[PDB]
Paper text:
SP can also activate NK3R with lower potency than NKB. Overall, the NK3R–Gq/SP complex is highly similar to the NK3R–Gq/NKB complex. From a cross-sectional view of the space-filling models, the orthosteric binding pocket in NK3R–Gq/SP resembles that of NK3R–Gq/NKB. Due to the conserved C-termini of NKB and SP, they share a highly similar binding mode with NK3R, and this conserved peptide-binding pattern was supported by alanine mutagenesis analysis. Similarly, mutations of N1387.35A, N1422.61A, Y3156.51A, F3196.55A, and Y3387.35A in NK3R attenuated the potency of NK3R–Gq upon SP binding compared to wild-type NK3R as shown by the functional assay. In the NK3R–Gq/SP structure, the N-terminus of the receptor is highly dynamic, and no direct interaction between SP and NK3R was observed. We speculated that the interactions between the N-terminus of SP and NK3R contributed to the attenuated potency of SP activation compared to that of NKB. This hypothesis is supported by the fact that replacing the N-terminus of SP with the N-terminus of NKB (SP chimera) led to more potent activation of NK3R than the wild-type SP peptide. However, in the NK3R–Gq/SP structure, due to the different orientations of the side chain of SP-Phe8, the distance between SP-Phe8 and NK3R-V235ECL2 is longer than that of NK3R–Gq/senktide complex. In contrast, the Nb35 subunits could not be built in the SP- and senktide-bound NK3R–Gq structures due to the nearly invisible density of the Nb35 components in the final high-resolution maps.
Neurokinin 3 receptor (NK3R) is a tachykinin receptor essential for the hypothalamic-pituitary-gonadal axis. The endogenous peptide agonist neurokinin B (NKB) preferentially activates NK3R, while substance P (SP) binds preferentially to NK1R. Herein, we determined the cryogenic electron microscopy (cryo-EM) structures of the NK3R–Gq complex bound to NKB, SP and senktide. Combining the structural analysis and functional assay illustrated that the consensus C-termini of the three peptide agonists share a conserved binding mode to NK3R, while the divergent N-termini of the peptides confer the preferential binding of the agonist to NK3R.
Residue numbers in the entry:
A (entry chain D): 3 to 340
B (entry chain G): 8 to 62
C (entry chain B): 79 to 114, 116 to 228, 231 to 275, 290 to 369
D (entry chain A): 5 to 11
E (entry chain C): 7 to 53, 181 to 361
F (entry chain E): 2 to 120, 136 to 247
The structure:
Amino acid sequence: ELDQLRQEAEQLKNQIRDARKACADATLSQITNNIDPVGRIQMRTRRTLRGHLAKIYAMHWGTDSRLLVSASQDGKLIIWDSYTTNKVHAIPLRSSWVMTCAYAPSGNYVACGGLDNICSIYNLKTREGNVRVSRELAGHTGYLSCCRFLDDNQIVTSSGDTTCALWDIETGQQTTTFTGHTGDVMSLSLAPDTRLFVSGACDASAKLWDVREGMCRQTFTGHESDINAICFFPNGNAFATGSDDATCRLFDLRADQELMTYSHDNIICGITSVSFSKSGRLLLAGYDDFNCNVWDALKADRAGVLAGHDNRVSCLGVTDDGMAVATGSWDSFLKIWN
Amino acid sequence: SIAQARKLVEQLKMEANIDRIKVSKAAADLMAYCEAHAKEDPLLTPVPASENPFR
Amino acid sequence: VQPSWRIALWSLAYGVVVAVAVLGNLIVIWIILAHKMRTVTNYFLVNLAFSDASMAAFNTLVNFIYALHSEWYFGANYCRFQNFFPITAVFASIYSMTAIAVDRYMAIIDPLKPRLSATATKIVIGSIWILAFLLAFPQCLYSKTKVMPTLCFVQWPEGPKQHFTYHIIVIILVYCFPLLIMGITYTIVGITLWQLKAKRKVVKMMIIVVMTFAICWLPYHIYFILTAIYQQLNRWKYIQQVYLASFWLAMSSTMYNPIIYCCLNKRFRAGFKR
Amino acid sequence: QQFFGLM
Amino acid sequence: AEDKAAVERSKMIEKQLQKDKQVYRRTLRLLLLGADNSGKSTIVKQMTSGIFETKFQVDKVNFHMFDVGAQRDERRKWIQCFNDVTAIIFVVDSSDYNRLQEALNDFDSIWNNRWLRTISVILFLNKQDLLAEKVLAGKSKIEDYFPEFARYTTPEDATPEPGEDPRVTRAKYFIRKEFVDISTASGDGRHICYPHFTCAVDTENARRIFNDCKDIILQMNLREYNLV
Amino acid sequence: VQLVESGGGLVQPGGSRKLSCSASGFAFSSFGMHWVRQAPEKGLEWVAYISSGSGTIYYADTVKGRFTISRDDPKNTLFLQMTSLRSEDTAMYYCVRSIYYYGSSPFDFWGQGTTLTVSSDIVMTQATSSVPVTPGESVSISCRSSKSLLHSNGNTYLYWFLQRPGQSPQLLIYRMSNLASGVPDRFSGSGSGTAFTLTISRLEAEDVGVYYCMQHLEYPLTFGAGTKLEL
């Protein structure tokens, strides 16, 4: 008798698709063809942060736009002073397979996680002068792919167990669990208002969650392969996903559907990291073709290229003030661009 | 599986009640946000070396 | 002066040697330092390539043009330079050969022990070059350029008993000792390495290198030892031909490194087509 | 005649 | 807070990083792969938590063995983390012929994985003492699952082991033939498989890994030095 | 966090003594360590400094070549050797915990102080020397420097301290605008490059003490005379 509700779900998905199509009056290209092109964007490597041993899987900027934490698969977090390339802290990790790192918006804590299935929280502002593990968030049955601080006591982690979990750092338990994805949730992006976040999973779907009620608001299924990167548009009304389809896609939360596709026939390799500029006009996208690609977020044009890395570009972060873009890679170097 | 597939149907009707707006309106809103903050984008419009803290 | 008959063949052989050597060596340097392989392992290699290029370009050509007619067409100040930089290039190329041999030895018999510190390589390169300079200094400071009616870039430190001992030192620690180290290293590596066609072609390379070094640098050193001890041989009317043969044999070692790298490594064999 | 060689 | 005292701190951190690079370079990282029926865990003891790490030393060489556990069935994403690893220790249950076919498919995906194209596989055909009994008795054979076993005969390599039934040799060298076939027909010369025969208790396994990792690093050095 | 100094007592001028500070409760190896003396009924005076890892070592001009600030990280003990003591060296020798990175707060913890009794520089001037006042009303304390403390970085290397009677100085404001840890938000530092003002919003019974200022722009570090606050 489950076939009846299976057909119900099929007709429901058809209803969603038809509603999305009926709301599709004009593409983003048709509306922004009449605006000035961004033009040739040329960033150059202002800083090169050296010191990581193995490949770099993740970076996160501090909210001060000067400090950045970097995660290396040698089992080390390094806090960098990007202005002076000074290593502020070198945090040795219990597990050598960290796949994500986060900076608390207050700057007091840094989170990391990876194949150990644990979101380790490190307190940078100890009175003893050493960075020590404030908490270890166990409870995920898969590898941790992303973590993002909401406050100094809340953090949402995405895991390879097809589940996103909201955590309480003081308690150490999952306040909420998001269980909609059918594949490894690879990326995670917090909305600027922090009330929502989006997830990208290997099931090619992107889901929008409410961090409070634990409800998946919307589901987006534009891609064809695993979504490796996700980032919110600066106003929180849209997000961009980068997949193994060698394609970046822009989705609108209110339109509930895809806006643009950022693909080039010359590129056939998956996107590892994705980010926006401060105004959201530039869509930076890391690739395993060893180089990042600057995109025109409104016209889907390749505005520029960041080609300073000698291995797969794994992480990518634009400062909160929008001054620079840092780009870590599997060659163990971060690069600050401007 | 019927209970598990019930949740799949539950979310699908739940996700079909969202109040959608025209893609024209959303595109216009994104363009307006990009235009408003284009002046404050050090990436879109590079600032001279005086204000750039990396050089 | 030399007759037009023999100088034709001498010029052809020397020109082919210099040309092949310099072309291959700068091609190797371009491949290493441009295709950033450009790793620490290819630093002794690029140092050896630069030393071989310097050898072929300066030492071989200048001493061939000087020995073709036994006339110094160069300035008196240049004579003091020819006994400093070409000679230090000779010694640096030989010491780069032996350092590369030792490096490959540690790479093969002890693979788990990692490559040098990426700065000890620079330390060894600098030590090689300063040792070559220290070795060539007696040839530079004590180099005369007396003219007569047709200049001759002679060298005369003291009586022949001191020139002989200098060339004995030079042979001992530039042919006998590098050959000993290279032979021991490469025979151990060949025993260890003796898919399987590559690990045997490497051994063939290494035995070729050891035998060619021992065969080429021996007459070159013996000629200078004999000439230093016996100045009566300088007026043999045939010592010029003996010197040309020995110098050609010694300086032909420059072309062998690029040929070895091309015939061995597929990456080099492909990058030489570009 | 004379001939040194200039190693 | 002087900047000169922060650069001194950053230089002191670099000094800690450089002496941690010495240990990281001198250590060898290994990835254990295999199914539940394969004696992967028994090898570990004889030499939520999403990764298990075993450190063993052979002849003053540090080996870091990374048994992956408490993950999902799909591994196309976290296997990228193990690129630039010294070797992959693949352990196979050679006795269970029904699950043996899935071991080749598991081995096939690892070998042709885009991120493990430069990583050699040290194959450990485990529980070969159980494999001898399963073919000496003859109750269950290989032809019931592999039709090409009847047309297979022992090659020139004829089991220089002290004493074993020729059918044991024919069967156990047929399992190698299936596994070596994948590593050769479906791969380049960038990485080499290293088949081995392993029992439930075999103290020689740490030496086999050391010898085979010595050869894997040897071919890395033969390529680092362009001697090939 | 705890710093305890040992050594002191009556010393003849033609003698010598060695001061030691045992550190406990923090990563002593990762902290630069300062010696700051305080003559009886006088202001603080910076004596010596040793960086983390026993690298950069500095001395005061009045003490350079005579004292030796040694450090033994494994025992978490800081030393200070004195070769030929003078009558001017009579002071309570504080030992200060200081760490330097972006956003750091050096001079944040001071030792309880050991007493030793013996039988150019950026001059910091606190014009006011005593500000008697009642609790409840805001209090402002001002100081001036010989040259601008506003570095090209964008931060003003000015540090405010408070030595309550019968206690050790404690950090209030670091880099002229940053509240220290555990300090109430009543205190507030201001200034542009040469004139600095510390504004206590609602002075309480614990604010009675001497409020020193110190520059960290260049060595030697120089303290002001300190403005006492009577009650």
